[PDB]
Design an enzyme around this catalytic site. Structure first.
Site, mmCIF file in Angstrom:
data_model
loop_
_atom_site.group_PDB
_atom_site.id
_atom_site.type_symbol
_atom_site.label_atom_id
_atom_site.label_comp_id
_atom_site.label_asym_id
_atom_site.label_seq_id
_atom_site.Cartn_x
_atom_site.Cartn_y
_atom_site.Cartn_z
ATOM 1 N N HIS A 299 0.854 -1.119 -0.075
ATOM 2 C CA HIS A 299 -0.009 0.069 -0.018
ATOM 3 C C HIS A 299 0.928 1.086 0.037
ATOM 4 O O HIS A 299 0.108 2.513 -0.218
ATOM 5 C CB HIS A 299 -0.974 0.036 1.126
ATOM 6 C CG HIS A 299 -0.560 0.204 2.643
ATOM 7 N ND1 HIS A 299 -0.003 -0.608 3.366
ATOM 8 C CD2 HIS A 299 -0.295 1.342 3.117
ATOM 9 C CE1 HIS A 299 0.386 -0.074 4.443
ATOM 10 N NE2 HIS A 299 0.256 1.091 4.243
ATOM 11 N N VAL B 118 16.938 16.822 8.756
ATOM 12 C CA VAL B 118 18.297 17.552 8.766
ATOM 13 C C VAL B 118 19.268 16.573 8.357
ATOM 14 O O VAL B 118 19.179 15.344 8.293
ATOM 15 C CB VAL B 118 18.628 17.870 10.126
ATOM 16 C CG1 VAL B 118 20.140 18.400 10.403
ATOM 17 C CG2 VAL B 118 17.707 18.858 10.722
ATOM 18 N N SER C 2 4.187 2.716 8.254
ATOM 19 C CA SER C 2 3.907 1.601 7.180
ATOM 20 C C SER C 2 4.819 1.376 6.387
ATOM 21 O O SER C 2 5.668 2.049 5.921
ATOM 22 C CB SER C 2 2.754 2.091 6.198
ATOM 23 O OG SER C 2 1.401 1.801 6.615
ATOM 24 N N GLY C 3 5.073 -0.155 5.984
ATOM 25 C CA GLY C 3 6.173 -0.397 5.261
ATOM 26 C C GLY C 3 7.701 -0.898 6.204
ATOM 27 O O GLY C 3 8.339 -1.396 5.227
ATOM 28 N N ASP D 73 0.224 -7.638 1.635
ATOM 29 C CA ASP D 73 0.461 -6.389 1.720
ATOM 30 C C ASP D 73 2.181 -6.341 1.901
ATOM 31 O O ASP D 73 2.823 -6.014 2.738
ATOM 32 C CB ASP D 73 -0.017 -5.642 2.785
ATOM 33 C CG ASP D 73 0.096 -4.049 2.757
ATOM 34 O OD1 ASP D 73 0.729 -3.424 1.702
ATOM 35 O OD2 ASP D 73 0.041 -3.405 3.874
ATOM 36 N N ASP E 2 2.029 1.272 19.973
ATOM 37 C CA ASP E 2 1.693 0.902 18.599
ATOM 38 C C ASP E 2 2.484 1.484 17.512
ATOM 39 O O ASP E 2 3.199 2.495 17.801
ATOM 40 C CB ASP E 2 0.163 1.083 18.479
ATOM 41 C CG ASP E 2 -0.308 0.430 17.379
ATOM 42 O OD1 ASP E 2 0.196 -0.590 16.753
ATOM 43 O OD2 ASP E 2 -1.695 0.081 17.415
ATOM 44 N N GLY F 261 2.425 6.761 9.109
ATOM 45 C CA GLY F 261 3.782 7.145 8.639
ATOM 46 C C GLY F 261 4.853 5.851 9.028
ATOM 47 O O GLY F 261 6.053 5.908 8.705
HETATM 48 CA CA LIG Z 1 19.093 13.250 8.164
#
Ligand SMILES: [Ca+2]
Ligand SMILES: O=C(O)N[C@@H](CS)C(=O)O
Lengths: 6, 223
Positions: free
Chosen positions: B40, B57, B177-178, B84, B171, B175
């Site tokens: 996904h 940064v 995911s994967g 997935d 949990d 952001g």
């Molecule tokens: Ca960096």
């Protein structure tokens, strides 16, 4: 609910 | 990651950020030219960022490498989230070092109660949003099949597992995911989905990597 950024 | 801790710079050297002009998903380096992520997370314009701690940064030890191939599992189903998993080939091989390192694939699946490390740059709040600059980490156990099915009746396939907590507060989240679920030095999971984040009785759900090791190997070998 997927956990990517949208 | 909700309820986790600051990992420490480059302490998770297989963790990558997938960037499309912003961080949108994680992934895991499995050899110098290939990353595992979630299906996904597929889109055009993926830049893989290796060696990262503060993703906002330029600190040193980063490598930014464009994806040259993004291969979703052919049987990925975007409604059920079955299968997935996605493989990303890097346009050029990453230079491996203490801060940029591959994670081993499993040789067998993990049992319920195995403790794992889940990491990412996702939201750190269970209500509202706060995105961290630096990489966050969470120690979490794999839950039993019966507990996972009770939490998400009718929704858990053989290619998924639950990990985390039922009491709330800890949990993976949007952001993450994967990104990786690593247990005893093996990539056993991919952050996939859940009902909200860190909610009571609703643990995170993860792609079960051990079911895909032969598929990963064959896909890499043919590409
Ligand atoms: Ca960096
Ligand atoms: O850490 C590594 O694997 N290599 C050294 C380079 S001399 C460094 O980058 O600090």
């Amino acid at each position: 609910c997927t956990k990517s950024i949208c | 990651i909700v309820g986790g801790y600051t990992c420490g710079a480059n302490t998770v050297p297989y963790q990558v950020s997938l960037n499309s002009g912003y961080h949108f998903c994680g992934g895991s380096l499995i050899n110098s030219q290939w990353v595992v992520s979630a299906a996904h997370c597929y889109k055009s314009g993926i830049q893989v960022r290796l060696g990262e701690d503060n993703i906002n940064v330029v600190e040193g030890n980063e490598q930014f490498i464009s994806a040259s191939k993004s291969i979703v599992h052919p049987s990925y189903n975007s409604n059920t989230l079955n299968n997935d998993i996605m493989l990303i080939k890097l346009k050029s091989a990453a230079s491996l070092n203490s801060r940029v390192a591959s994670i081993s694939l499993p040789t067998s699946c993990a049992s319920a109660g195995t403790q794992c490390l889940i990491s990412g740059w996702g939201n750190t709040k269970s209500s509202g949003t706060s995105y961290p600059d630096v990489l966050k980490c969470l120690k979490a156990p794999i839950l039993s099949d019966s507990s996972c099915k009770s939490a998400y009746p009718g929704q858990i396939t053989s290619n998924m597992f639950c990990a985390g907590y039922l009491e709330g507060g800890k949990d993976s989240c949007q952001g993450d995911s994967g990104g990786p679920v690593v247990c005893s030095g093996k990539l056993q999971g991919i952050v996939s989905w859940g009902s909200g984040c860190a909610q009571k009785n609703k643990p995170g759900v993860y792609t079960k990597v051990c079911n895909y090791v032969s598929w990963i190997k064959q896909t890499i070998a043919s590409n």
